[PDB]
Amino acid sequence: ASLATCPSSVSVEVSADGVNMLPLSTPVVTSGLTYIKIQLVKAEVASAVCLRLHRPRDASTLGLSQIKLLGLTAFGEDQVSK
Amino acid sequence: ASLATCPSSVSVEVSADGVNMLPLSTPVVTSGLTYIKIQLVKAEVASA
């Protein structure tokens, strides 16, 4: 409804062991985006994730609706050619 | 109310004589801006 409060850029840091927190890339810009998709080409073994959301371009507040964490569990063509 | 449709960048061109249309600068990004302000340091005599 009011995405003027959407963060300008978000920086994701992951932790397989849950303590060593390492960045993944430069903060991806998110201003003016209705649907935030961050694809991971390589599926990452993660126990802890830190989301550093930066201040919006023309706002001092953050308005958020839902966080989804899409992944696979341990037991939940090109792969043979090599 | 719904600024998801706000343009990403605007490129302003002026014409003192109204025919020779020429750019002023690189398009300034504007996505996620509620108030679009372009300050002109040197005031410009523009007809178009």
mmCIF file of N, CA and C in Angstrom, chain B residues 9-46:
data_model
loop_
_atom_site.group_PDB
_atom_site.id
_atom_site.type_symbol
_atom_site.label_atom_id
_atom_site.label_comp_id
_atom_site.label_asym_id
_atom_site.label_seq_id
_atom_site.Cartn_x
_atom_site.Cartn_y
_atom_site.Cartn_z
ATOM 1 N N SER B 9 13.975 6.914 -14.232
ATOM 2 C CA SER B 9 14.823 8.074 -14.471
ATOM 3 C C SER B 9 14.193 9.044 -15.461
ATOM 4 N N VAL B 10 14.417 10.337 -15.241
ATOM 5 C CA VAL B 10 13.894 11.385 -16.110
ATOM 6 C C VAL B 10 15.062 12.146 -16.731
ATOM 7 N N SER B 11 14.989 12.378 -18.042
ATOM 8 C CA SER B 11 16.005 13.140 -18.764
ATOM 9 C C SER B 11 15.336 14.390 -19.331
ATOM 10 N N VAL B 12 15.692 15.542 -18.775
ATOM 11 C CA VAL B 12 15.126 16.832 -19.158
ATOM 12 C C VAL B 12 15.952 17.467 -20.276
ATOM 13 N N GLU B 13 15.265 17.963 -21.304
ATOM 14 C CA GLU B 13 15.894 18.675 -22.405
ATOM 15 C C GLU B 13 15.236 20.042 -22.549
ATOM 16 N N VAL B 14 16.028 21.091 -22.773
ATOM 17 C CA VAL B 14 15.484 22.439 -22.918
ATOM 18 C C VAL B 14 15.785 23.000 -24.302
ATOM 19 N N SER B 15 15.102 24.104 -24.608
ATOM 20 C CA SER B 15 15.242 24.813 -25.875
ATOM 21 C C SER B 15 14.947 26.278 -25.604
ATOM 22 N N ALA B 16 15.989 27.106 -25.686
ATOM 23 C CA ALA B 16 15.799 28.543 -25.572
ATOM 24 C C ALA B 16 15.017 29.070 -26.764
ATOM 25 N N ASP B 17 15.369 28.615 -27.965
ATOM 26 C CA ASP B 17 14.705 29.033 -29.189
ATOM 27 C C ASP B 17 13.491 28.184 -29.527
ATOM 28 N N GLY B 18 13.249 27.106 -28.788
ATOM 29 C CA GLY B 18 12.062 26.309 -28.976
ATOM 30 C C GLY B 18 12.189 25.227 -30.025
ATOM 31 N N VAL B 19 13.312 25.167 -30.747
ATOM 32 C CA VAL B 19 13.538 24.164 -31.782
ATOM 33 C C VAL B 19 14.771 23.309 -31.495
ATOM 34 N N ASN B 20 15.888 23.938 -31.139
ATOM 35 C CA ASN B 20 17.108 23.206 -30.809
ATOM 36 C C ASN B 20 16.916 22.593 -29.433
ATOM 37 N N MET B 21 16.560 21.314 -29.398
ATOM 38 C CA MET B 21 16.246 20.643 -28.149
ATOM 39 C C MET B 21 17.495 19.884 -27.722
ATOM 40 N N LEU B 22 17.964 20.131 -26.502
ATOM 41 C CA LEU B 22 19.220 19.520 -26.099
ATOM 42 C C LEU B 22 19.221 19.061 -24.646
ATOM 43 N N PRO B 23 19.906 17.951 -24.348
ATOM 44 C CA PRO B 23 19.887 17.393 -22.988
ATOM 45 C C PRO B 23 20.656 18.248 -21.991
ATOM 46 N N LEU B 24 20.253 18.149 -20.725
ATOM 47 C CA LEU B 24 20.908 18.893 -19.654
ATOM 48 C C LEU B 24 21.949 18.104 -18.871
ATOM 49 N N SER B 25 21.700 16.823 -18.608
ATOM 50 C CA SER B 25 22.592 15.965 -17.827
ATOM 51 C C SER B 25 22.110 14.526 -17.969
ATOM 52 N N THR B 26 22.847 13.607 -17.341
ATOM 53 C CA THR B 26 22.444 12.210 -17.316
ATOM 54 C C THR B 26 21.115 12.075 -16.576
ATOM 55 N N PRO B 27 20.258 11.139 -16.996
ATOM 56 C CA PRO B 27 18.949 10.971 -16.344
ATOM 57 C C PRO B 27 19.114 10.674 -14.863
ATOM 58 N N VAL B 28 18.529 11.524 -14.034
ATOM 59 C CA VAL B 28 18.582 11.331 -12.591
ATOM 60 C C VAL B 28 17.594 10.246 -12.191
ATOM 61 N N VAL B 29 18.056 9.306 -11.363
ATOM 62 C CA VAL B 29 17.191 8.227 -10.911
ATOM 63 C C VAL B 29 16.087 8.801 -10.032
ATOM 64 N N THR B 30 14.878 8.247 -10.167
ATOM 65 C CA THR B 30 13.723 8.771 -9.452
ATOM 66 C C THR B 30 12.832 7.703 -8.843
ATOM 67 N N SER B 31 13.139 6.421 -9.018
ATOM 68 C CA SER B 31 12.327 5.368 -8.425
ATOM 69 C C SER B 31 12.349 5.450 -6.903
ATOM 70 N N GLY B 32 11.174 5.305 -6.294
ATOM 71 C CA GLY B 32 11.068 5.408 -4.853
ATOM 72 C C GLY B 32 11.132 6.808 -4.289
ATOM 73 N N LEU B 33 10.874 7.830 -5.099
ATOM 74 C CA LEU B 33 10.898 9.216 -4.652
ATOM 75 C C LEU B 33 9.477 9.767 -4.609
ATOM 76 N N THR B 34 9.077 10.298 -3.448
ATOM 77 C CA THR B 34 7.746 10.884 -3.312
ATOM 78 C C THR B 34 7.678 12.318 -3.818
ATOM 79 N N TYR B 35 8.796 13.034 -3.791
ATOM 80 C CA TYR B 35 8.856 14.426 -4.213
ATOM 81 C C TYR B 35 10.039 14.574 -5.146
ATOM 82 N N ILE B 36 9.779 14.946 -6.389
ATOM 83 C CA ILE B 36 10.840 15.044 -7.377
ATOM 84 C C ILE B 36 11.282 16.499 -7.455
ATOM 85 N N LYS B 37 12.505 16.767 -6.996
ATOM 86 C CA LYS B 37 13.098 18.099 -7.019
ATOM 87 C C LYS B 37 14.357 18.079 -7.872
ATOM 88 N N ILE B 38 14.399 18.907 -8.913
ATOM 89 C CA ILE B 38 15.613 19.106 -9.702
ATOM 90 C C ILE B 38 16.011 20.566 -9.572
ATOM 91 N N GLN B 39 17.003 20.802 -8.720
ATOM 92 C CA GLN B 39 17.567 22.124 -8.549
ATOM 93 C C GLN B 39 18.465 22.461 -9.725
ATOM 94 N N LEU B 40 18.244 23.637 -10.291
ATOM 95 C CA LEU B 40 19.035 24.154 -11.393
ATOM 96 C C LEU B 40 19.986 25.196 -10.816
ATOM 97 N N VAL B 41 21.293 24.917 -10.865
ATOM 98 C CA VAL B 41 22.261 25.864 -10.312
ATOM 99 C C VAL B 41 22.312 27.154 -11.128
ATOM 100 N N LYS B 42 22.301 27.055 -12.453
ATOM 101 C CA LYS B 42 22.279 28.220 -13.325
ATOM 102 C C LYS B 42 20.896 28.312 -13.946
ATOM 103 N N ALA B 43 20.151 29.351 -13.565
ATOM 104 C CA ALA B 43 18.796 29.581 -14.058
ATOM 105 C C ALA B 43 18.771 29.707 -15.573
ATOM 106 N N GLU B 44 17.844 29.000 -16.217
ATOM 107 C CA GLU B 44 17.906 28.876 -17.671
ATOM 108 C C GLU B 44 16.718 29.488 -18.398
ATOM 109 N N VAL B 45 17.007 30.308 -19.407
ATOM 110 C CA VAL B 45 15.989 30.882 -20.286
ATOM 111 C C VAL B 45 15.555 29.777 -21.249
ATOM 112 N N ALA B 46 14.373 29.207 -21.020
ATOM 113 C CA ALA B 46 13.877 28.076 -21.799
ATOM 114 C C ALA B 46 12.496 28.373 -22.363
#
